[PDB]
Amino acid sequence: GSVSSVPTKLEVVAATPTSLLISWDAPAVTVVFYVITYGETGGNSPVQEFTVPGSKSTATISGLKPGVDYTITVYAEYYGMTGSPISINYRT
Amino acid sequence: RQLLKDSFMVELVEGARKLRHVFLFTDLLLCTKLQYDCKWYIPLTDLSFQMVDEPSMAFRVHSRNGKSYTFLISSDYERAEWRENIREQQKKCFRSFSLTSVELQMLTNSC
């Protein structure tokens, strides 16, 4: 591809001990929807995922455990292809 | 063109639920009613598969033309299998197309 399929600048913009507000910069191409995944870092806990529409570039993650390291990833879904993910770690 | 996966599924439509037989071919996803009749199809290169957790164990397929269709499936595992198989094949599909009336007949016949 001639432009990146991946979002940029994934970051936690606000946090409580059990919830995170994340933001990312959309890729150059219109996205059908995004997938957000989160799970305990290294913890062999179940990873969970949800979506937000391609018109949104933020999401809230709730129900987390305080003081726990989490790995959060976002990737874009398109007609005909799935984008690669961008990932961050964050400790509640 | 080969058949890779097929299952009964329940389509959620306006005010009703419908039993469909869904077929993943190498280049397209086909939805039929029961002799078979095609309700609709989407080339894989024009499709996006979305997990739906409300209702639970559901998914939505979006077509490049702006339509989308929602199904209940039997389990989270089968739902994940369908997404993975579709993704694997999407990596091998590059060109959008439209089937002629007879092509669809032959396609439905093969079913």
Author numbering:
A (entry chain C): 1 to 92
B (entry chain A): 707 to 740, 750 to 769, 830 to 886
Authors' text:
Homology modeling indicated the presence of a unique insertion of 59 amino acids (residues 770–829) between predicted strands β5 and β6 constituting almost a third of the entire Bcr-Abl PH domain. Since the presence of such a large, putatively flexible element can dramatically interfere with any structure determination approaches, we deleted this part of the PH domain. In contrast, crystals of PHΔ770–829 in complex with the same monobody diffracted up to 1.65 Å and allowed structure determination of this complex. The structure of the PH domain comprises the canonical PH domain fold with a β-sandwich, in which four β-strands at the N-terminal part of the protein pack against a 3-stranded C-terminal β-sheet, and a long C-terminal α-helix, displaying high structural similarity for example to the PH domain of Sos1. In addition, our construct further includes a C-terminal helical linker that was required for the stability of the PH domain. Based on our biochemical data, the PH domain forms a 1:1 complex with the monobody, which binds to the β4–β5 loop and the αC helix of the PH domain via its variable FG loop. In the Bcr-Abl PH structure residues K724 and R726 in the β1–β2 hairpin, in addition to K739 and K754 in the β3–β4 hairpin may qualify for the PIP-binding interface. To identify the PIP-binding site of the Bcr-Abl PH domain experimentally, we soaked the PH domain crystals with a soluble PI(4,5)P2 derivative and found additional electron density at the expected site. This density partially fits the PI(4,5)P2 headgroup, although minor sterical clashes remain with the surrounding residues.
The Bcr-Abl oncoprotein is expressed from the Philadelphia (Ph) chromosome, which is formed upon the t(9;22) reciprocal chromosomal translocation that fuses the breakpoint cluster region (BCR) gene with the Abelson tyrosine kinase (ABL1). Bcr-Abl is a constitutively active tyrosine kinase and is selectively inhibited by imatinib (Gleevec), which became a paradigm for targeted cancer therapy. Due to the different translocation breakpoints, p210 contains a predicted Dbl-homology (DH) and Pleckstrin-homology (PH) tandem domain that p190 lacks. Here we provide high-resolution structures of the DH and PH domains that unravel unique structural features.
